[PDB]
């Protein structure tokens, strides 16, 4: 017999933020971005 | 046969063999073999950024 177990977790997080303000007239523009990529893998084998 | 004949006499040894027991002990024979193997592996990683 052999009994085999594997566990695996992967996480990624990314953020971007930008804001601009001009005065002359007056103007503003802004943006926000957020991100995640995530993976889980579990794999097993058993022989008898 | 009364005359020698190697084959027909040899049949005697085929059927009955060459010898008989004049002394002996009778008994029991016990033979045992036991063999065990175990292999065990563990791993656990963490990485964080």
Describe this structure in words.
Chain A: Glycans are attached at residue 3. Chain A: Belongs to the complement C6/C7/C8/C9 family. Chain A: Monomer or dimer; as a C5b-7 complex it can also form multimeric rosettes. Component of the membrane attack complex (MAC), composed of complement C5b, C6, C7, C8A, C8B, C8G and multiple copies of the pore-forming subunit C9. This is part of a larger assembly, with chains A (48 residues) and B (49 residues). Chain A is built from no helices and two strands. The radius of gyration of chain A is 24 Å and the shape is rod-shaped. By secondary structure, chain A is an all-beta fold. Chain B has one helix at residues 6-16. Chain B has one helix and no strands. Helix content of chain B is 22%, strand content 0%. Chain B starts with 5 loop residues before the first helix and ends in a 33-residue tail after the last helix. Chain B is mainly alpha-helical. Classes of the chains: A mainly beta (48), B mainly alpha (49). The chains hardly touch.
């Amino acid at each position: 017999f052999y009994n085999s177990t594997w566990s695996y977790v992967k996480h990624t997080s990314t953020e971007h933020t930008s804001s601009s303000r001009k005065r002359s007239f007056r103007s503003s523009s802004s943006s926000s971005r957020s991100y995640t990529s995530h993976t889980n893998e579990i794999h097993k084998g058993k022989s008898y | 046969p009364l005359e020698y004949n190697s084959a027909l006499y040899s049949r005697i040894f085929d059927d009955f063999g060459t010898h008989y027991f004049t002394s002996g002990s009778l008994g029991g024979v016990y033979d045992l073999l036991y063999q065990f193997s175990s292999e065990e592996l563990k791993n656990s990683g963490l990485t964080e950024e």
